[PDB]
């Protein structure tokens, strides 16, 4: 579990994101899509985007970026007490969008990357440790619900 000190680091770093949610959200999704092009294909909504230039110009991608990060931010602020918030996300991502848990690992990596890129020398080793733990907890609890539903993998 996370200690209170680690949760404080996580939420202090999250304050950087909240200064510019749409910007961080677009940066994270583009990193995901370019690093792991198979993820783009899970989005009928964005499949048409071929180049990074097109992704950067898409206002709808920014809009989904706010939706995604708004949901993740509310979950982090629960400090692990997130059962009610996680349940619908697990259910829709497992049974409707058909997202393997591996992709949740990829986007976790993309978040860490983007934070380093946007905040050089301002994302501490302690904070990276804490964020990593918090995203692992998120994956673990979603994975538990995937396994229930027969989607483990
Ligand atoms: C930090 C992890 C993530 C969060 C917080 C998140 C959150 C959300 C939210 C709030 C929605 C809208 C409501 C819903 O459909 O449940 C959504 C939709 C969706 N998500 Fe995610 N998501 C995450 C990861 C991913 C990943 C890794 C993929 C695929 C590679 C993915 C694929 C999709 C798709 C395809 C939709 C539907 C978009 C549309 O057609 O409007 N999500 N997500």
Curated annotation (Swiss-Prot):
InterPro entries in alphabetical order: Globin, Globin-like_sf, Myoglobin
Phosphothreonine sites (modified residues): 67
Residues where O2 binds: 64
Binding residue positions for heme b: 93
Record annotation: effect of changing residue 121 to A: In metmyoglobin
Domain Globin: 1-147
Pfam families xref list: Globin
UniProt KW Cytoplasm keyword: yes
Top class in the EC scheme: oxidoreductase
Intracellular or extracellular location(s): Cytoplasm, Sarcoplasm
GO biological process: removal of superoxide radicals
Keywords in alphabetical order: Cytoplasm, Heme, Iron, Metal-binding, Muscle protein, Oxidoreductase, Oxygen transport, Phosphoprotein, Transport
Residue list for modification Phosphoserine: 3
Enzyme Commission number(s) of this protein: 1.7.-.-, 1.11.1.-
Binding residue positions for nitrite: 64
Recorded GO CC terms: extracellular exosome; sarcoplasm
Catalytic activity from the UniProt record: Fe(III)-heme b-[protein] + nitric oxide + H2O = Fe(II)-heme b-[protein] + nitrite + 2 H(+); H2O2 + AH2 = A + 2 H2O
GO molecular function, one term: oxygen binding
Subunit structure, interactors included: Monomeric.
Function description: Monomeric heme protein which primary function is to store oxygen and facilitate its diffusion within muscle tissues. Reversibly binds oxygen through a pentacoordinated heme iron and enables its timely and efficient release as needed during periods of heightened demand. Depending on the oxidative conditions of tissues and cells, and in addition to its ability to bind oxygen, it also has a nitrite reductase activity whereby it regulates the production of bioactive nitric oxide.
Stated family: Belongs to the globin family.
Protein name: Myoglobin
């Amino acid at each position: 579990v996370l200690s209170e000190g680690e949760w404080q680091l996580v939420l202090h770093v999250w304050a950087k994101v909240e200064a510019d949610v749409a910007g961080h959200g677009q940066d994270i999704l583009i990193r995901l899509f370019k690093s792991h092009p198979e993820t783009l294909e899970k989005f009928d909504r964005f499949k048409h985007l071929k180049t990074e230039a097109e992704m950067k110009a898409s206002e709808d991608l920014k809009k989904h970026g706010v939706t995604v990060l708004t949901a993740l931010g509310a979950i982090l602020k629960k400090k692990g007490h997130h059962e009610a918030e996680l349940k619908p996300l697990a259910q829709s991502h497992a049974t409707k969008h058909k997202i393997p848990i591996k992709y949740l690992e990829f986007i976790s990596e993309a978040i860490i990357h983007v934070l380093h890129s946007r905040h050089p020398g301002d994302f501490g080793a302690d904070a990276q440790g804490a964020m990593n733990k918090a995203l692992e907890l998120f994956r673990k609890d979603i994975a538990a619900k995937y396994k229930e539903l027969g989607y483990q993998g």
